[PDB]
Paper text:
The m6A “writer” consists of the catalytic subunit m6A-METTL complex (MAC) and the regulatory subunit m6A-METTL-associated complex (MACOM), the latter being essential for enzymatic activity. Deposition of m6A onto RNAs is achieved by the m6A methyltransferase complex (m6A writer), a large holocomplex of ~1000 kDa in size that contains methyltransferase-like 3 and 14 (METTL3/14), Wilms’ tumor 1-associated protein (WTAP), KIAA1429 (VIRMA), Zinc finger CCCH domain-containing protein 13 (ZC3H13), RNA binding motif protein 15/15 paralog (RBM15/15B), and E3 ubiquitin ligase CBLL1 (HAKAI). Here, we report the cryo-electron microscopy (cryo-EM) structures of MACOM at a 3.0-Å resolution, uncovering that WTAP and VIRMA form the core structure of MACOM and that ZC3H13 stretches the conformation by binding VIRMA. Our cryo-EM structure reveals that WTAP forms a homodimer, with each monomer consisting of four tandem helices (H1–H4/H1’–H4’ with coiled-coil interactions) and three linkers (L1–L3/L1’–L3’).
To understand the structural basis of the MACOM function, we determined the 3.0-Å resolution structures of the HWVZ and HWV complexes using single-particle cryo-EM analysis. To our surprise, in the cryo-EM structure of the HWVZ complex, only three components (WTAP, VIRMA, and ZC3H13) can be found, while HAKAI is missing, although it is present in the SDS-PAGE analysis, indicating the high flexibility of HAKAI. Human WTAP (residues 64–247), VIRMA (residues 334–1585), and ZC3H13 (residues 1492–1643) form a compact structure shaped like a “warhorse” that represents the core of human MACOM. Unlike WTAP and VIRMA that form saddle- and horse-like conformations, respectively, the C-terminal fragment of ZC3H13 is only one-tenth of its full length and contains eight α-helices, but it does not exhibit a rigid conformation. Our structural study shows that ZC3H13 uses its C-terminal Barding domain to interact with VIRMA and induce the conformational change of MACOM.
Author numbering:
A (entry chain C), B (entry chain D): 64 to 247
C (entry chain B): 1492 to 1643
D (entry chain A): 333 to 579, 619 to 1409, 1428 to 1585
The structure:
Amino acid sequence: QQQQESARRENILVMRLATKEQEMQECTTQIQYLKQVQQPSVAQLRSTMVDPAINLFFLKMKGELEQTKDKLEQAQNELSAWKFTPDSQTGKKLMAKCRMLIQENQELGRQLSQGRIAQLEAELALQKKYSEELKSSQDELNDFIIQLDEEVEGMQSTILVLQQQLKETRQQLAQYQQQQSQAS
Amino acid sequence: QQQQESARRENILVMRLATKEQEMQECTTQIQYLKQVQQPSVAQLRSTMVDPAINLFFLKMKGELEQTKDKLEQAQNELSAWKFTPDSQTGKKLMAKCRMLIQENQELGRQLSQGRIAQLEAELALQKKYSEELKSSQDELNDFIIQLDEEVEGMQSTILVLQQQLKETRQQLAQYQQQQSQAS
Amino acid sequence: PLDVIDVDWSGLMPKHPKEPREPGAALLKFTPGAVMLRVGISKKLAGSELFAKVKETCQRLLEKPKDADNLFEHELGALNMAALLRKEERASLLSNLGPCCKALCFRRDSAIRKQLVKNEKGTIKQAYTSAPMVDNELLRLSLRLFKRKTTC
Amino acid sequence: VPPMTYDPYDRELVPLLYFSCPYKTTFEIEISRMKDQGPDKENSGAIEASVKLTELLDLYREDRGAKWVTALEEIPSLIIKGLSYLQLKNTKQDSLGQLVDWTMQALNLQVALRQPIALNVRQLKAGTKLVSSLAECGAQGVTGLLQAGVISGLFELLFADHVSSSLKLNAFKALDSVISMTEGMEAFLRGRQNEKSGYQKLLELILLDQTVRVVTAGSAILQKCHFYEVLSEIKRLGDHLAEKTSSISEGEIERLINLLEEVFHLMETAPHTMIQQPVKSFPTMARITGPPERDDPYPVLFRYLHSHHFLELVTLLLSIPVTSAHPGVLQATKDVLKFLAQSQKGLLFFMSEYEATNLLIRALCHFYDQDEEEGLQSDGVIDDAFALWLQDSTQTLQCITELFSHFQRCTASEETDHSDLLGTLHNLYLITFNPVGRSAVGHVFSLEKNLQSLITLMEYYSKEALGDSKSKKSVAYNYACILILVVVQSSSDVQMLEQHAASLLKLCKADENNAKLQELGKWLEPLKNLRFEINCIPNLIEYVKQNIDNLMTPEGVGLTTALRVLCNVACPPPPVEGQQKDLKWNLAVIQLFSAEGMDTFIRVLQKLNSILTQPWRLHVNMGTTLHRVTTISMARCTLTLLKTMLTELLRGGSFEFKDMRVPSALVTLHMLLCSIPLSGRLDSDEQKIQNDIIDILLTFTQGVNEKLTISEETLANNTWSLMLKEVLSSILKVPEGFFSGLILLSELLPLPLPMQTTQVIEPHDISVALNTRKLWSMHLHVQAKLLQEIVRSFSGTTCQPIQHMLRRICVQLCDLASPTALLIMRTVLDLIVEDLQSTSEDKEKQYTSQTTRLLALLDALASHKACKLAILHLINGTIKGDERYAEIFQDLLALVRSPGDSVIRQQCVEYVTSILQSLCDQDIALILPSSSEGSISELEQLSNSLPNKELMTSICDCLLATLANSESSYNCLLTCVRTMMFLAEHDYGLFHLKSSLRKNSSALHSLLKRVVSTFSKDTGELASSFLEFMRQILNSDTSRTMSINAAELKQLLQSKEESPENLFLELEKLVLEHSKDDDNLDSLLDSVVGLKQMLESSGDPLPLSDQDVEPVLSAPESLQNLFNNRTAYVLADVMDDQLKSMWFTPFQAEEIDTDLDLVKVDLIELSEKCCSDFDLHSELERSFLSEPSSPGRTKT
């Protein structure tokens, strides 16, 4: 019909209006962000501390300072290495530092060995085997619980049957010794 | 029915959509201005206000950078003076090895804490904990099964006593009938 | 200067060396007293005699005469359970932290401090600082609806 | 055309249409469906049951044999369909009555023992199942059972001897099915007269030693009985309030608040303590046995909440002025409503009580209006928009019903209704414009096959318009696309995808040219061939690891899903009490370590902050709410994964985790997300992110035993000390991270002692609270060299937040133990002594505004217990290198006793006088004063809380010279007379005050001349304090054993030959203040006429005594001993104001914000060539903002 497609196009138009309204709402929220009347203190902090110029210059100065510091480290230790003689105090302490460094490097290479990784994987496989053994014990234990429940139900049925037998024979013997004590 | 007023609603919806899209364009230009205009140039970059704490940071870093640079130049001038000695070359190679070990030891310590061995020890501890929790709850399930089997043995004792009572009352009825049929 | 410090090392969580359990000691928290403590009973619909008997069964399970005679002071059941849970939570506020548990932090310490300042009944009363827009039309509608529902 | 503008509260709820009520049982649901829907051919499955059900009820009318037992075993499968058809067809021989009598015959033990062996207990079990299936049959069936005596019938099997424990579990299931109806619960709580009630029978049954699962079922019945009872007491209190307000103690209102929080806490732990566990499920601490299937207790907690009109009660409580005024009532009822609105059942509860829900939405929206109408709503009363959230949640579920029940109509007919479908989709889309409305839409479609609505809508209109458009755009298809896109984007509970990830993907594959459907496909990519189990988290980790490069990028947005699905299936929900731990949450963590997870979550965090760091600096701050919600969801999910991994690894015994990428990435993610919120207060999700960051940073403080603290070699390499290094050395790294590192280091450290308790803390817990602080101090004294740099760098700043956070840390971190206390205080004192030196020599000290800020820090520190004693043990003069501290204190005293006249020195003298006041205050100490016996003696509590002899002499000299010198300010004189009032409370302080008055004898006289010379109505406070101090020296002559009479007091006041008439001046002006004003003048002339009556009581000229003996003080205990024996708790029912001062934001508009920022003009460009040659800063800074201004992955 004519009003058919007329209302269909009206639906498409209100769809476009809704999506444009969503975009306008997003832009309005972003305005409320950018035109927020923030606290004086948070504005103070944003302007003084996270200002990109001051912050980037701080980065550059820290980097240059640490570069110069490690360069001075390199130069000073190279000096003390030129001043190295085997029985010097700095000499003994330096070869001892290198020796304990070799010790620590041997230790670290040991803790990273393929032998240590193999022992750790063996322990992990052993623990996984133990956990699946516990799961198998758990299945055994579940079946034991099922057996116990089935047999207590059977025993309760047996008790009820025995109580019925007992009541029957007991009332029989009672009525008998009663009505036959009635006979002289 | 008629399409006139519905098409009128359609085209006024179109003009509403045009107004909304132009408001959205205004919002986009406004947020672009608000978010991109702030850029500091040499004009303000040469008259930046900084906190007293940040200025003290800059002054401390400048001062200690100057001191470290001075000691650095001094040490590197002293480096050019020292002449080649056998023990000096021994110390040079010794401390080259010392540096390389200083670097390799941290490169290996980060592997020991972020690599395969850390994941393996974590899986191992977690599997140990999982198995210990599974077993610590299977112990409670074993105590509850002790409860159930005590129930079993109690019901079995009751079955035994009821069976003895049924037997004695049944033989009592048999004998009382065999007597009081000829007597009573 | 800057005095030498050492710590007595006793805040670690209990059962750390984990000495093995006694056979038949997992059904110890399922005795009548231990169950009634976790559940709590109500005096107004358990009766006088039965409430007395249950409180007696619970008392001889508690080892602290303070808590033993502070048992079940409310007439509601869930309120008794909540009072016991609050007693145990207050007792466990500072007991589980330190060496082998996560050390104290600002959030957790603030929480346990706001817990310590709460008296029993578990609440510190807030003072009025604001009030809603009293729309007595809404109040009339609410009262009418509540009464209608209470009737049918 | 629908209104594209949205007023959220204009639409209101109507009765449910598609989803059955949550409290209705299956029988009632079936009978209502067959009633209203009429005689459909769904009757078919009914009749073959019904005619069968009546063929068993007419075949065993009086037969009770084995065949009857086999019929009992069959009846429960026919009561749902059969009995309902019978009851609604009104073909009634009272088949329900015959069923109830069958049930009473079956539960009978006498009838039971007359059966064969295999099936005498089968009859009892079948009668139990009959109870359970007939109580779930409406008021009709449950009252039929109750009248026939089912409670005292079930309590025959439970009390009989020699009965299977499985049969008792069955009888308990039957009893839980009876009392799940409110008629049953009423008959169970209040039994017949001259009989024990069901509750009393149950209590008597538990008091016999029962099997573990039997007493657990008893506990599960008792918990539900207590819940019903709490609800009944709430209903009683509410009806009381209704009758009292129609035509109220604070005690009963606090009781109502307690009952409401009790209802909340009972509904929270209900699926663990109110359900009947299966007969094979034991209550072990970790579920290992029995079926996994449990039955949720909410379909009966809602029957209770409905039979007691709980929503009407909360509507009243929120609409009645006296109770609504309480914040406790609002918060406690909002807890319950927010819990109800979490689940599909609870959300259908609100829509069943649609009238009560409308009125409740109104009563809740009134609060959220007045909140910003009178308050500012950032740190006062909390605002979470719960009114709007609940309105939009119930509205979107109403639209879900209107959208489901439009496909129950197009398959029983064909489409004659399209416009209402489209209007529903539109009113559902408009809700997704807010962030709260969008969160509610994403949360409601994420509940129990609700997403199936839009899914089947798109499956329909993809066979009608070839998807998007065949000859018509089929706008409903586009609405459904947008909706199933916003729910996938915004939801964080990703369980909904578990069953739909297939369908949606097919949809995403059925239309490859739809701009929204292919984005949805990118969102669902990690769910191709996935199963949401702990065996496929290796695949999810492989996905997160394979395209980690695309994080804030629309082509790697599906990674977000791969971190929600991976947080849904591997992170246990926050555990509630009474819950038995499931063991898969262990395996889910093991599999989360096997497939490398510590690596590919550290990498997620690292790339997350490497992406966010540039918009953070450029102040874009996650603008578009879509990108913000995805980045917050990704951060929170990665943090939850890391938190569960570390807290599950580090609890499995004492383990040591030294990755050191986790803290270095977290102290940056905190800076980027949680540190500087432009609102000045963290959000909810950002607060959760900060809490997760602090928890992960604290999991490095576990596993620290004696064997890890013997030597400084094994202490500085400990995991605690490594985390502390990565947190501290990340504070002085970049000025952007200053405030973040501070607001984080202050969340790691514990609050300062003493604890304000209502009751005593047993010595073990105070020992633990002392030892955890000793341990924090032991681990901080290795980073002492960074703590000193922190308190040297920020001390002397004008940024109010950083200043306040440093001022807070220096109290938290100074109260841990003696070493760190002396560390912080030595640093602050060295800082002030090098600020007073290094600029002054051969002359007086130069005081600048840097000195002013430094003294302000020292002041606001000295007013705390630990910091003040750390000052005292440095000024005292026992030199450990501490001579300069005593010298600088003498220099500060010289400053105050000779202020000169400036605006800087007149600003520093008030700070040093506040210092002096905090030093001479005995209510500020580690050993707090207490006249309770068995404690420290009074005179030995001042030897450890006041200056020593030669320091107290100088302090009294200074406090007098600052009164004599009339150049002093007003606040200075106020704090000095306050310090004098403090010192005038004991013979030590008063002896020194008098002995100093013997040198400066015109101190109080000139002070009184100052009081009268510049008196005003605001100056009255100084006069009041001075007259209080005056009385405090004569109140004893009509605590201390040595005071002055009125005679020599007035002699000290006697320096003018009109000083009595100076008192007369004060009097005549005092009555002349207003006589038009407050209680100032009458109290003040009371005091001063008392003083002048003591004046006339004696002759004035009397020299002050000299025969008095000084009360000597013992050696001050070493600061370590004071920190050892410190008051760890005080009996007070209110928080200390100093502790309460640490809870509000560090962002204060201006109360610490200095009017003189001393912002030093610095020329940055010249500071390049003076250093090593560096880039032109203009180029570097313009490289960042030219093109890339949108949030997320940008140029740099």
